[PDB]
Design a protein around this ligand. Structure first.
Ligand SMILES: [Cl-]
Ligand SMILES: [Cl-]
Ligand SMILES: [Cl-]
Ligand code: NA
Ligand code: NA
Lengths: 129, 127
């Protein structure tokens, strides 16, 4: 029944380049059978969370899905933007995990416990990987 | 101290005339000590929001102030255009007000809690 999630450690990938982006470490510790691993650590970027939230909104129960932190850049500093984003991503996952139809989602499990890309998850869930 | 802002009740002013326009009720309630009124209700039109943002962005320097909804009528109907505008205007104010960055801006206060026109605000703050 314990599922503890943390979002930490923003890092810049491909820094300086056309395709630079920030990603976040996601730690999960759980004794839940929802998950193949008791402990996992993966990195995900904001756009993958956007993909995730939309996938969760296809849930079979039509249950509402917690909000993500937004795209607003209205911050004195980039550090503040990233920290508020990090907090908001962690809060999002905490709340997702409290909803049984969302917690049990097979694509959530692939998001949290693998580093399959979004297209790779999409291929996996069609048996095309 | 929280600031609650709502943009509601779009209405057509001067309906059927050359100078017809839509405006919006801006309702604010706050326990923030800086505001002159705990609850205010003013009406503002889109062009006034455009004026406001320009003033706010000058104050912010290179910090990017929240975007306004645009002019392009990409929604299918006037009703949908106005409702999405209203939502966008509320979102703009929510983001503006939820940060400490612009809360000292004289123009913002007069926009929100007076029914001074834009020229009158400009005159007020210029002396
Ligand atoms: Cl971007
Ligand atoms: Cl497969
Ligand atoms: Cl009228
Ligand atoms: Na084990
Ligand atoms: Na209305």
């Amino acid at each position: 029944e314990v599922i503890t999630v943390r979002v930490q450690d923003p890092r810049v990938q491909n820094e300086g380049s056309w395709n630079s982006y920030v990603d976040y470490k996601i730690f999960l510790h759980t004794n839940s059978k929802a998950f193949t691993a008791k402990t996992s650590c993966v990195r995900r970027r904001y756009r993958e969370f956007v993909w995730l939230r939309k996938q969760l909104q296809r849930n079979a129960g039509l249950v509402p899905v917690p909000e993500l932190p937004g795209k607003s850049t209205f911050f004195g500093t980039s550090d503040e933007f990233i920290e508020k984003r990090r907090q908001g991503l962690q809060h999002f996952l905490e709340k997702v995990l409290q909803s049984v139809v969302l917690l049990s989602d097979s694509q959530l499990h692939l998001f949290l416990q693998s580093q399959l890309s979004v297209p790779e998850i999409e291929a996996c869930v069609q048996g095309r990987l």
